[PDB]
Amino acid sequence: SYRFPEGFLWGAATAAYQIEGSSMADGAGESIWDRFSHTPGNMKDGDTGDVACDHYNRWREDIELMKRLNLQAYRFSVSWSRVIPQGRGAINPKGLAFYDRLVDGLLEAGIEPLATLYHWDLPAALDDRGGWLNPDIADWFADYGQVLFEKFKGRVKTWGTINEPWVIVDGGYLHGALAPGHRSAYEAVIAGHNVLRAHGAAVRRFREVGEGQIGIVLNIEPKYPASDKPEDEAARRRAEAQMNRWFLDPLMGRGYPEELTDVYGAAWREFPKEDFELIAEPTDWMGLNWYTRAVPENAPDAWPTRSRPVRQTQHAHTETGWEVYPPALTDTLVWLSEQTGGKLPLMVTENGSAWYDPPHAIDGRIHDPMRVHYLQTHIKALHDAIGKGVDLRGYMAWSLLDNLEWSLGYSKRFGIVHVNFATQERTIKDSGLLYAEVIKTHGDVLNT
Amino acid sequence: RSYRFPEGFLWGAATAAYQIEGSSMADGAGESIWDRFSHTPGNMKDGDTGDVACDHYNRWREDIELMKRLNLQAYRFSVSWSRVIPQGRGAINPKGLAFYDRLVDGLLEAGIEPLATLYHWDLPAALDDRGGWLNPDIADWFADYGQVLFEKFKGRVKTWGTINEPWVIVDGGYLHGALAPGHRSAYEAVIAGHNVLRAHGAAVRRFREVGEGQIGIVLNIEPKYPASDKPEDEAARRRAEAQMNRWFLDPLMGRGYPEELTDVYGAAWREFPKEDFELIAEPTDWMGLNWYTRAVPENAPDAWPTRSRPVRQTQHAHTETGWEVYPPALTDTLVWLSEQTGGKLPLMVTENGSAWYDPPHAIDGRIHDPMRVHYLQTHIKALHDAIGKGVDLRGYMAWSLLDNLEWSLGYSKRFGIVHVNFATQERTIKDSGLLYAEVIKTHGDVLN
Amino acid sequence: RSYRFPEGFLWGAATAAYQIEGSSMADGAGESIWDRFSHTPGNMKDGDTGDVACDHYNRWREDIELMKRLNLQAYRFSVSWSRVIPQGRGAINPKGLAFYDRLVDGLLEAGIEPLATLYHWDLPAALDDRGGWLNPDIADWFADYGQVLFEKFKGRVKTWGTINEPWVIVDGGYLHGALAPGHRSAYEAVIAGHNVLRAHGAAVRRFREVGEGQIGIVLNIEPKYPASDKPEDEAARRRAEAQMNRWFLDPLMGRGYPEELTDVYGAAWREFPKEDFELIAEPTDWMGLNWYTRAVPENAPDAWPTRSRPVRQTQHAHTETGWEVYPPALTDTLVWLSEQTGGKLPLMVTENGSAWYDPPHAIDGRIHDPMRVHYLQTHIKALHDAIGKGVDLRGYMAWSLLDNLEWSLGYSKRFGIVHVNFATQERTIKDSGLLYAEVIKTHGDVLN
Amino acid sequence: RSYRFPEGFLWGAATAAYQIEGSSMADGAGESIWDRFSHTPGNMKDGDTGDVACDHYNRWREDIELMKRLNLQAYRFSVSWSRVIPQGRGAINPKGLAFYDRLVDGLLEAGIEPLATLYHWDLPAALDDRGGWLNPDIADWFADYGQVLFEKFKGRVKTWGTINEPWVIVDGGYLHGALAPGHRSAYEAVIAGHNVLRAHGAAVRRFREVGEGQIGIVLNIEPKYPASDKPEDEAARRRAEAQMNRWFLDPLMGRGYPEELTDVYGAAWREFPKEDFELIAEPTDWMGLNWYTRAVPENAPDAWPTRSRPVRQTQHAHTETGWEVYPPALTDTLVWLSEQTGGKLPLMVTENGSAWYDPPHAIDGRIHDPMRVHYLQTHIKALHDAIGKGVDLRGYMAWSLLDNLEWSLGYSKRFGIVHVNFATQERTIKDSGLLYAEVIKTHGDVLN
Numbered sequence A: 001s002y003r004f005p006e007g008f009l010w011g012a013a014t015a016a017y018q019i020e021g022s023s024m025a026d027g028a029g030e031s032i033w034d035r036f037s038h039t040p041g042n043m044k045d046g047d048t049g050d051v052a053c054d055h056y057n058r059w060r061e062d063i064e065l066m067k068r069l070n071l072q073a074y075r076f077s078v079s080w081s082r083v084i085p086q087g088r089g090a091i092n093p094k095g096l097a098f099y100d101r102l103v104d105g106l107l108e109a110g111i112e113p114l115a116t117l118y119h120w121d122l123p124a125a126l127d128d129r130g131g132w133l134n135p136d137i138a139d140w141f142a143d144y145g146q147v148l149f150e151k152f153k154g155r156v157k158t159w160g161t162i163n164e165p166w167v168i169v170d171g172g173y174l175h176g177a178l179a180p181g182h183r184s185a186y187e188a189v190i191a192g193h194n195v196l197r198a199h200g201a202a203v204r205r206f207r208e209v210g211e212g213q214i215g216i217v218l219n220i221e222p223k224y225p226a227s228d229k230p231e232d233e234a235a236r237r238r239a240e241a242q243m244n245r246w247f248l249d250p251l252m253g254r255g256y257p258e259e260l261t262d263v264y265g266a267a268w269r270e271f272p273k274e275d276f277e278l279i280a281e282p283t284d285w286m287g288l289n290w291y292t293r294a295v296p297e298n299a300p301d302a303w304p305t306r307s308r309p310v311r312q313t314q315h316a317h318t319e320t321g322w323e324v325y326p327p328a329l330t331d332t333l334v335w336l337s338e339q340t341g342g343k344l345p346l347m348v349t350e351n352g353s354a355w356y357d358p359p360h361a362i363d364g365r366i367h368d369p370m371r372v373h374y375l376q377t378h379i380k381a382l383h384d385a386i387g388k389g390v391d392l393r394g395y396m397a398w399s400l401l402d403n404l405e406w407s408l409g410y411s412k413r414f415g416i417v418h419v420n421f422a423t424q425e426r427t428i429k430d431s432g433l434l435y436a437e438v439i440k441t442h443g444d445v446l447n448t
Numbered sequence B, C, D: 001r002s003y004r005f006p007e008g009f010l011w012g013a014a015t016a017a018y019q020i021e022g023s024s025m026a027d028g029a030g031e032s033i034w035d036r037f038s039h040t041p042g043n044m045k046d047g048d049t050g051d052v053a054c055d056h057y058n059r060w061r062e063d064i065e066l067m068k069r070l071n072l073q074a075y076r077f078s079v080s081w082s083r084v085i086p087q088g089r090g091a092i093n094p095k096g097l098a099f100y101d102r103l104v105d106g107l108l109e110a111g112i113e114p115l116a117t118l119y120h121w122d123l124p125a126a127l128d129d130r131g132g133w134l135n136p137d138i139a140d141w142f143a144d145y146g147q148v149l150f151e152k153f154k155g156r157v158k159t160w161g162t163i164n165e166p167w168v169i170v171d172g173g174y175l176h177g178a179l180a181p182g183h184r185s186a187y188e189a190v191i192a193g194h195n196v197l198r199a200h201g202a203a204v205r206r207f208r209e210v211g212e213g214q215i216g217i218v219l220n221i222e223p224k225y226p227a228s229d230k231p232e233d234e235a236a237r238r239r240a241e242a243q244m245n246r247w248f249l250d251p252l253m254g255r256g257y258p259e260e261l262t263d264v265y266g267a268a269w270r271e272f273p274k275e276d277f278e279l280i281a282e283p284t285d286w287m288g289l290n291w292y293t294r295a296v297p298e299n300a301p302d303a304w305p306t307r308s309r310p311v312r313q314t315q316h317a318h319t320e321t322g323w324e325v326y327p328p329a330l331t332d333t334l335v336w337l338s339e340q341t342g343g344k345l346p347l348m349v350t351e352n353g354s355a356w357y358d359p360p361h362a363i364d365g366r367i368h369d370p371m372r373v374h375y376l377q378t379h380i381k382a383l384h385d386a387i388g389k390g391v392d393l394r395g396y397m398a399w400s401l402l403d404n405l406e407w408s409l410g411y412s413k414r415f416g417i418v419h420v421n422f423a424t425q426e427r428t429i430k431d432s433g434l435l436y437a438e439v440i441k442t443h444g445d446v447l448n
């Protein structure tokens, strides 16, 4: 039996820049990704989110698709620069009105709106003032949060602050593969600290003006042993500290992992005690974004963790090159439950897989059997976790739609609904068909 | 819509020695250029080699059993020159010859037509040390090698292929160097191309003297379509077309070399003795077509040596090898090739198929490959269209029978209609293979 | 022909703080962007940093003795912003200011005129974290920094430079990312350039309020010559000329931004408030020119963003930095710059010199410098030619006094007229600085 | 300090055919592998070829005058195989052979001893088409080629060299592919090296039959020094040493192949029949040493195939080809080579010199090359040190007489003691050449 607990919430997730398009429309401001994507060499095939899924225009169609999928929740992000073009100061009413209509549409459809404040699209105007390197951003972010907290009070009840601080910082400040495209360990350390402070400040503001539940969203990639060599275990700890514990540990009031002094070396810094008090402001829930695991070994020339993943050729890999290994999802959920004392409600806010699909539907269908297989095995892994006592309250499939996979462009399809980027025609994939049935049966269909 | 095929139409599947056999040093087998090439670092993806491959040398009995499950009427395979004659010239390796002796007898008795190819890219290293395809004497070495097989398998193998894809042998092996023997030279490419043709002609002459049955060459054609109405693009198209599709076909048809090659190869181009062209044009009994895709070339001044590059056709699906999926071009090519041969040369599609990601292991004893399924059914229909237009097409060989070593791309590119678990050597018939077996049994009727 | 120079013509040598000082953390000095950039792997050739450099912070007295041996009449240096004001704003570091206090006293006492530059590329990291040159507030930050020096050195430093080479600051640091802070964005480049201009103006205004002497900016100019008669190439030349040579000069002369920048920077280009340009065009008392070579631009469609690239001038010598040796272009540039200023602005060649290979140690107390010696003779002569056509040229600063850290190219590029053995810090006067010392003594007569 | 050399000690300068002659197709000359290699895009720096070079084929009389101006007692040159025998075997090219006929007569009449090298890397393309150095027959082709020269210049050329630098021929041409014929294969490298040795032996045997004078091989040696006291590094040093310095010397001394080569080349290594080693160790009359620098190899697991890499010796000067300047290593090498040959073989430094930047044209009728001057004097001194230690050194040939085509590095690397302006073909004696002319004249007394 794979029936899920009472009240278990099923949904799907997106992000603003990945689906919306209409980057300049109706007074929308300029974001770091507007700039980054229009700089040559940054994006695969020169792709941008200028059009994407055209969701800003086709959201009503997209809500209809959600209903066909029997979604009970829809997780989305708000574009900071669409609502507050200069990041601070004047509101863009028409921009804010889009989310206003969207949320009401969802509520009328009986779909719970789960909003994320920040999904990587920082206003360019704030980047010009230092972005995540400017400690004032904690205040700017809380103010932005307040606007949505009050505007949507009683409508959006479950809130996420930051989506994946690691990717934001590792990609955007440490290695430069993502906006704003900086490459510096000095900046990475500072950016990481201010992301945490910003989350904390947003939660404090939420206690003052908000209604419902608030939490952060972390991606975790569990690190498994490559050998019995002590050098590899040390490497595994470095990889694990830099990716999985960097943010979780201070969030739990335990300070930064000890290994970061070694990983970041001279770039490492100590911060005032009041910062850590702020960062550890108690939350109501936490989101887990999960896709795969890694098997790190020692890699002396790899900067800065001195580690590299060992290819697990015994298992399938997705088109993004990620190992398919559902037991590690169960392990990670158990681990995170322990890290939170089993007292913090958990929600898989993202999980899914990318495989090749044709650019157009065939016979009005898209057959994606590997995405189908990934979906069912990982949902089963959720059930195993719940059986081991993990307080897990929901699952959001990434993603609702094929979309802009950031720097990898449109070449990587994560959607359970196929998007023809030439015609904007939507087609529900076989994965989406199965998912709609998983929801209807509350897991029962996984028996067969 | 009826897709019933002509009476006597031959259905089979194809492989090549180095891609499936393994046992590279076993039982007195000689060293080939691919034994050397694959064991040189940086040449092969993931450092893959053909040392084990599908272990077909050991498991051929199992594979014949698979052919019977697929209802195959023919099996197209290549003979390893260096397995049969270790030094390329001189002493026979009896136990190596015995493998093909057993294989053919096994096939005949299964009621399967053995279609043998003399050369599928695995030149003996000992001959490479004597210049390989750059030594004009290779025409004679090849004829001698052919004679051994012609006489040994007389009355058993009745349909013979000489050279499989002279273009890939030369473009890859001598012009750009991505394939064995890994040379990069326009000067050598011109010469190697000429001797490949001469070697083919010499083998046909030898066949008339000592052979029994039908003999021909196997060409790959990639039809070149217009990118625009710009004259410089049409000139680009003609260059690309001449270098890839007409380079070998024209002198094989007694029309000398394409005029554009003087422009393409410049100072590397040469004139050859008239007696060479007499040899090259030695009349054949049939011709094989290897076909996968089309291209849409545009002018590209810095592209060496044709000054052309393909325009990505984003409107259509692409395989994992990056090839556009477009079956009408197959119909067009067959008509074109029929015209170029006056409609009097029997044609056979000796290779056609597609590469898509498959997991490294079967899942519940199945491999679901819907895009390979779709490719298969659409291109087989495209054959029927060609036959309806008067093309003398007498057979179809699916590439490939097994997932195998895709040369420099290693095992990462799966062409098989039968899945091979390269960890365990377990075979699993893919959904594409299941459909093909039904296409054969119904002689096309399953397509309607 | 006499190559004697007008009375009052000032002879000197030039350096920059980060390139020579070392002692990055010494005596409460702050962290700069070059402290970060240089310690990030892959940014610097051979992993060189400015941690030690010429150890000038410790050896400045010895170096002043060398200036005397060279018969220098002026010494041009830069003040390290973060050494004086560690956080860029607020609390002053007394000891950091004490060093420059002592240095200036030492110069005047030795009879050598101190020419201070406010900004030579080493922005405080604290200010970079607030947006750096992307934050419009930096004009105020810079002015306050300038005031601290203007007052401190009232009556001692009489000739002031504000910004050293805005183009290199922006093109290298924000457009292409080859220099600190290592950003790569046309959007940021436009904004940074504007704020660099604004900061210059605000500095000049503050100077009028609180300072005694003359003040000006220092531009680098690289004259663009025709590569052919082709229209495309002439358009390329304008784009190249506009982006490098006119971008800053034109608004400094109140002529606005060059029209071609709209074409070069496309969607990244922006229009600014008219009040900004009035601040930018604040009257200066002089202008400095950095000159080394010319360029011969041709059309290059894939070269971003000017769509131009230099044609190698094989008929002439090239320095180790790859710059063509062509002294006539210095004469032309000086005339051109005189035209652009209107003859009403005093000019001073504030950097000129060349890099050639020298051994890492002196050979028998000597460094034989024939090509650098030759460069100096031919280029000093070209000044006279300019003075001969009535350009108001009032001085010449040789780059550089010492072999130093050539930024990203590390210590591998030696510009010094004095050799520095980076292994021992031992100084050795090159033949180049030795012809130079003689040129001053004879005031240009030795050149006849 | 006394630096007078023994009576009879022979002073000269050296060139190679392809590097200086030009006139690649002139007067019935055949095509070589370097004609092909150099005209393939990507192979040569700046796309440089030897089509013109120093135009020596046309200007050899002017050059002979230069040798007299330099008071050369000897001129070491190579004969172009394909210029004399266009197809490598068969018909002789009269006018091609006539060129070397007149050249030798001009030298003798000028009192300059002609030192001919049979093979300086320019294999006939026609023989490369037969496998080149991978074909065991090449020993006979080379012997036949030698005989043509041995008889033509009987009594006129008395000192003969067979192979110039087997290591560079094989390491560059067959192992790494940086030189013609551009192959990259350890399997081919092992075989090529063996046939080069066999060809050397066969040529010496033929010389005994039909020639007059003294014959020997020319080896390059690059002495390997310890990088540390780590065992991993000493093993790397031994691997590097065996593959570069002992690979050819040891079998030439009847000592067989170094045992480390089974470790360096692994599965590519082969055993050869005992008869071959008799041929290889065919007694010679003298041996040449090409020497320029040393190396300090450390362990490099990823470096193929020796798994070693040189540690940059920053304490010393390096030439423009990146070679450390360290004269004591020259003395050590000569002592080593003397010991290896039992002291009973006469030796001659047959190449030594250095590359530094020179302008493309003379500055007024002079080229001041102080670092090349310094290299020359310090190394000629190191020769004297060697002779003082008992090494039977009989002469010294400066590499090179003229600035020429430095193979793949093009004309960018100047080794000449005489400057060549490749725009005008005008020659100008460098200061190094002026010093050399006096060193000869005082028989070393100037070094005093």
Ligand SMILES: OC[C@H]1O[C@@H](O)[C@H](O)[C@@H](O)[C@@H]1O
Binding pocket: A015, A018, A163, A164, A219, A289, A350, A398, A405, A414
């Ligand atoms: O597809 C990879 C995904 O990684 C997730 O963790 C991010 O939240 C998504 O925006 C992204 O698309």
Ligand SMILES: OC[C@H]1O[C@@H](O)[C@H](O)[C@@H](O)[C@@H]1O
Binding pocket: B016, B019, B164, B165, B220, B290, B351, B399, B406, B415
């Ligand atoms: O590239 C896919 C296939 O192309 C064919 O034409 C070759 O004969 C095969 O060996 C290869 O696997």
Ligand SMILES: OC[C@H]1O[C@@H](O)[C@H](O)[C@@H](O)[C@@H]1O
Binding pocket: C016, C019, C164, C165, C220, C290, C351, C399, C406, C415
């Ligand atoms: O590139 C050589 C020199 O260029 C000058 O314009 C810069 O001001 C120096 O700091 C630099 O060393």
Ligand SMILES: OC[C@H]1O[C@@H](O)[C@H](O)[C@@H](O)[C@@H]1O
Binding pocket: D016, D019, D164, D165, D168, D220, D290, D351, D399, D405, D406, D407, D415
């Ligand atoms: O490796 C030694 C080689 O050095 C090069 O600089 C010369 O040009 C060659 O002729 C010589 O054989």
